[PDB]
């Protein structure tokens with residue numbers, strides 16, 4: 001495959017400057033690593049602090065550039081379970097304000113900084129300083145009320161996190177915290193935000209085409 005293992009973590013290169021990190025609780029969860037010139041940016045923690053430290057040490061070994069910041073895509077264990085490891089390593093952390101507000105209730109450690117969003121879903125840019133190619137979009141409530149998404153400018157890649165399921169999926173997975181009414185529109189809004197992205201990365205399946213977006217929305221239509 002060309003995948004690399006480091007400890008409990010698996011890494012897959014998606015583009016010259018983009019890798020997928022995969023950690024396991026065994027249920028896989030995926031996030032991203034982005035090389036932006038002389039620094040690295042992370043999207044999502046692993047499930048645990050130990051696994052998240054393994055991400056950081058793989059970065060040091062294989063890329064050897066400082067990790068400037070991390071953005072985490074909602075307040076659940078697969079995305080924010082490793083916040084203490086990021087803070088211990090001195091990595092500035094960012095999440096939706098609503099994720100930070102929900103974090104204690106969800107058993108997560110809040111990020112240091114809060115992202116806020118316009119009515120059209122786009123991040124208010126002063127809340128996302130020096131984000132380089134990361135384009136942060138809040139598509140509306142779906143998998144959770146706080147779920148956010150990230151496009152990588154200059155690439156074909158957009159990250160749907162746990163909102164988006166793969167195009168062969170039989171269900172929308174864990175709907176315990178979901179907004180079943182608004183989910184379909186939120187999935188479609190993600191697609192519209194990143195209209196040229198052709199590789200859709202998501203939390204619990206391998207990267208897919210845009211078919212994942214329209215399939216997710218079709219399944220979500222049946223919840224309303």
Ligand SMILES: [Ca+2]
Nearest residue numbers: 049081083084
């Ligand atoms: Ca912890």
Ligand SMILES: [Ca+2]
Nearest residue numbers: 105106176177
């Ligand atoms: Ca919950």
Ligand SMILES: [Cl-]
Nearest residue numbers: 015016017018
């Ligand atoms: Cl790239």
Ligand SMILES: [Cl-]
Nearest residue numbers: 194195196197
């Ligand atoms: Cl796009």
Ligand SMILES: [Zn+2]
Nearest residue numbers: 074076143162
């Ligand atoms: Zn979740």
Ligand SMILES: [Zn+2]
Nearest residue numbers: 078162203204
């Ligand atoms: Zn998830």
